[PDB]
Amino acid sequence: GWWNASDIPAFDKSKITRQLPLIKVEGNRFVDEQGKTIVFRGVNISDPDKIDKDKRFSKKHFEVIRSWGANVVRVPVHPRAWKERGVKGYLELLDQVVAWNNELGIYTILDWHSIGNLKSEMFQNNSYHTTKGETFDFWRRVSERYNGINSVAFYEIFNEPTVFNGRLGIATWAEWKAINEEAITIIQAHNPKAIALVAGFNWAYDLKEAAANPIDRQNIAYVSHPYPQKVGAPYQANWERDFGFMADKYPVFATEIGYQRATDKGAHIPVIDDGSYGPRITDYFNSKGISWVAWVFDPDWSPQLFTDYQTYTPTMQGEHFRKVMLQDNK
Numbered sequence: 105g106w107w108n109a110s111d112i113p114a115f116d117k118s119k120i121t122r123q124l125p126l127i128k129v130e131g132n133r134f135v136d137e138q139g140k141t142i143v144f145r146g147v148n149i150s151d152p153d154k155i156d157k158d159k160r161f162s163k164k165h166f167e168v169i170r171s172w173g174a175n176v177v178r179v180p181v182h183p184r185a186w187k188e189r190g191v192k193g194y195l196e197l198l199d200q201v202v203a204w205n206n207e208l209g210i211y212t213i214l215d216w217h218s219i220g221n222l223k224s225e226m227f228q229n230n231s232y233h234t235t236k237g238e239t240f241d242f243w244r245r246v247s248e249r250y251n252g253i254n255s256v257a258f259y260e261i262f263n264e265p266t267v268f269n270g271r272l273g274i275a276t277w278a279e280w281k282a283i284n285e286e287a288i289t290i291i292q293a294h295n296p297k298a299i300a301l302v303a304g305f306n307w308a309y310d311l312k313e314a315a316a317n318p319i320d321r322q323n324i325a326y327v328s329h330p331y332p333q334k335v336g337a338p339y340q341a342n343w344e345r346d347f348g349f350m351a352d353k354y355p356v357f358a359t360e361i362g363y364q365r366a367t368d369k370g371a372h373i374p375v376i377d378d379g380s381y382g383p384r385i386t387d388y389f390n391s392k393g394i395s396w397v398a399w400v401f402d403p404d405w406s407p408q409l410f411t412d413y414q415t416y417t418p419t420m421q422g423e424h425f426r427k428v429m430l431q432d433n434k
């Protein structure tokens with residue numbers, strides 16, 4: 105594993121030729137060098153490990169992302185792929201995504217893509233299995249190697265915290281705050297410009313517990329994954345109550361949203377919807393200044409943003425998020 109990893113090279117500086125502007129948090133906003141507010145709207149790729157196995161791992165794929173108007177790309181590093189490639193093999197993919205995004209002008213979010221209760225080591229399935237030690241070691245290596253590369257602006261500590269109603273144990277917000285604080289200290293000690301993205305429970309949906317007892321670190325923003333079936337009923341009023349109101353105080357980065365019909369490929373709760381969710385959520389996010397990232401720019405993982413690699417034809421949700429990214433990104 106990670107505890108074996110022998111002499112990993114440093115990032116190859118010759119792979120990039122420009123420095124994107126520095127992003128930072130100021131009160132509830134992301135701002136640039138000049139103090140201008142920046143709202144990010146982007147896509148998740150699938151795991152670089154899958155893209156490479158698909159024989160699609162080249163700059164071309166990221167150039168398509170750029171033509172869809174995205175100004176950020178989230179990279180979901182699965183602990184299973186990190187173990188299968190090994191640290192050295194995996195960093196060879198990850199350095200290429202970082203370099204490509206950098207040359208295309210696109211910011212990167214590094215996402216440690218597990219689901220469940222890290223404190224008790226119970227995960228939604230083995231694809232996500234890790235440990236506190238492996239997670240800290242990952243944050244330590246990536247914050248060390250990408251230090252000073254401004255496009256690597258966001259470090260998303262742990263994709264979706266959930267206890268699944270006790271099926272995955274017990275972990276209070278207080279205990280999850282302390283774990284995020286240690287990860288943030290590691291990351292900031294390697295990379296002082298790093299912005300950490302922190303999530304709460306119900307699969308990174310809730311921010312009420314965070315609001316009542318916020319992470320004690322600076323330059324932090326908060327995550328929500330408000331998929332179509334997280335709540336029904338009056339949608340906006342429910343979203344505002346569960347996580348949206350947080351955006352009046354800290355920036356909120358909604359690092360997954362997506363939807364597809366009951367009959368679409370891989371359709372599953374909570375992503376099923378007639379289609380009215382797309383306009384409704386990007387309007388609501390515009391009303392709150394909330395950044396977001398659609399899931400997933402891949403033709404297999406569900407819900408898909410496009411139908412196949414031959415054409416990159418957008419699906420229903422792809423068409424809508426592409427139109428809004430082209431139109432609203434500044």
Ligand SMILES: OC[C@H]1O[C@@H](O[C@H]2[C@H](O)[C@@H](O)[C@H](O[C@H]3[C@H](O)[C@@H](O)[C@H](O[C@H]4[C@H](O)[C@@H](O)[C@H](O)O[C@@H]4CO)O[C@@H]3CO)O[C@@H]2CO)[C@H](O)[C@@H](O)[C@@H]1O
Pocket residue numbers: 182219263264306307329331333334360370373374375399404405406407
């Ligand atoms: O990771 C590769 C794999 O990913 C799938 O996409 C996932 C993302 O990895 C993940 O971040 C996220 O997870 C889902 C989660 O899998 C669901 O089990 C969970 O469902 C909850 C729901 O949120 C509750 O409100 C309801 O009460 O309970 C159910 C469980 O009973 O919801 C979260 C999201 O909230 O996002 C993606 C789902 O699109 C790919 O789709 C898959 O094809 C790939 O292997």
